[PDB]
């Protein structure tokens, strides 16, 4: 059976947010033990609510298990800027287990901040391989979603580009690097290329000319 | 409680074995959960062992791929997986269980299989150069291009440059991994003042400073 979350929510400090648990069969009951695991920065991940509401030793009065219609849910009462993460359910299944796709939780804790762009043509060094990347850094930027769209000569490409996940700065806005590989000869039959990075609606691009 | 070794190289075909040491409570009184992490597939179960008794029950895409044991005397788990392909280079968490609750978790042990050798950087500086924009401060960078295994260490003039530094994630082309750092300075002090990007690759001893020069 596969097991259904929301992909994203946003809320902001001292507010109720609620996520909820399909399990596509549905009829979630306490036969299923519905479990609530926090996902944050480097990996780390806090078992928060097991037992379908049973709080895990430690965790915040906060953060409460239920059912709600024929799903399982996770409240949190008077979000924190810290409860910013990813949030994955768990249900079992006698004999097994199985995890959600999780849900990305935004915490508004500081004011939205549009991406710095910065577009780096390829080394002169670099060329001297037949090979041409372009960089495209992204800072500061919160919330921590972005998409980037490529530009060459003005029309989107979309082959040989690498966009990191974005990573989360020490001041707490977001950060990602989009790569654009060429050959040296690729890199001379065009002149124009731009990184083109959307957010919250709003387009900023970078552009330089060969 | 949980204690995992961060991360494992594994050659392709090879098996891994990796531990989970306990700690703060009774290794004999809760289950111990294994669980694996991927992008394009989230958590996955495999299974799960119950130190006290022994039993043991597995996922159906991992029984006949992973093995899992428990040491009651060294309160110490473990979980051995086999033939490894490169779709099992994943984050894999053991997790302690409890009247249904996965409580605890280790910090995850990064497995990555794959056949490259040890492989140092190309480093190249990035300056603005090709339509830019010219304004009030200056960002500048360096691509650490193409080493194998990871990491590597950015600094700028040996330190100097602390103030709007940005190390990005790596990212892999191919089996290689590339990841650019950079640093953001008043306009005057560039390039009037010397910036420089120093890079060390201390699995192949490779160090390489590279100044940023007006393209
Ligand atoms: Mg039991």
């Known amino acids: 059976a596969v097991v259904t979350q929301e992909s994203a929510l946003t809320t902001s400090p001292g507010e109720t947010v609620t996520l909820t648990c399909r399990s596509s069969?549905?009829?979630?009951?306490?036969?299923?033990?519905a479990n609530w695991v926090q996902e944050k920065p480097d990996h780390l991940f806090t078992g928060l609510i097991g037992?379908?509401?049973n709080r895990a030793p430690g965790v915040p009065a906060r953060f409460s298990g239920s059912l709600i219609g024929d799903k399982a849910a996770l409240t949190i009462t008077g979000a924190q800027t810290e409860d910013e993460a990813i949030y994955f359910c768990?249900?079992?299944?006698?004999?097994?287990?199985?995890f959600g796709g999780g849900t990305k939780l935004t915490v508004l804790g500081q004011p939205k901040s549009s991406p710095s762009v910065t577009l780096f043509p390829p080394s002169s060094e670099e060329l001297e391989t037949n090979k041409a990347t372009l960089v495209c850094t992204i800072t500061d930027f919160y919330p921590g979603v972005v998409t980037v769209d490529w530009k060459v000569d003005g029309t989107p490409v979309t082959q040989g580009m690498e966009t990191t996940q974005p990573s989360k700065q020490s001041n707490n806005k977001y950060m990602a690097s989009s790569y654009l590989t060429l050959t040296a000869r690729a890199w001379e039959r065009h002149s124009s290329y731009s990184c083109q990075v959307t957010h919250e609606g709003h387009t900023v691009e970078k552009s330089l000319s060969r | 409680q949980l204690q995992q070794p961060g991360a494992e190289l594994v050659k392709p075909g090879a098996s891994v074995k990796m531990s989970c040491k306990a700690s703060?409570?009774?290794?004999?009184?809760?289950?111990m959960h294994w669980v694996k992490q991927t992008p394009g597939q989230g958590l996955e179960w495999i299974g799960v062992?119950?130190?006290?008794?022994?039993?043991?029950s597995y996922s159906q895409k991992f029984k006949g791929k992973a093995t899992l044991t428990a040491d009651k005397s060294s309160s110490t788990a473990y979980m051995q997986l086999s033939s490894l392909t490169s779709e099992d280079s994943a984050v894999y968490y053991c997790?302690?269980?409890?009247?249904?609750?996965?409580?605890?978790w280790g910090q995850g042990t990064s497995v990555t299989v794959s056949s490259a050798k040890t492989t140092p950087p190309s480093v190249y500086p990035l300056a603005p150069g090709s339509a830019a924009q010219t304004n009030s401060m200056v960002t500048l960078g360096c691509l650490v291009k193409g080493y194998f295994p990871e990491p590597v260490t950015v600094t700028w003039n040996s330190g100097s440059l602390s103030s709007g530094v940005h190390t990005f994630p790596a990212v892999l082309q191919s089996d290689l991994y590339t990841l650019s750092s950079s640093v953001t300075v008043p306009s005057s002090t560039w390039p009037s003042e010397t910036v420089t990007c120093n890079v060390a690759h201390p699995a192949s001893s490779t160090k390489v400073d590279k100044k940023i020069v007006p393209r």
């Open positions: 997790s302690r269980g409890g009247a249904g609750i996965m409580a605890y």
């Open positions: 703060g409570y009774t290794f004999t009184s809760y289950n």
């Open positions: 062992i119950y130190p006290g008794n022994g039993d043991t």
């Open positions: 069969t549905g009829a979630v009951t306490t036969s299923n033990y």
């Open positions: 037992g379908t509401n």
């Open positions: 768990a249900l079992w299944y006698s004999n097994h287990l199985v």
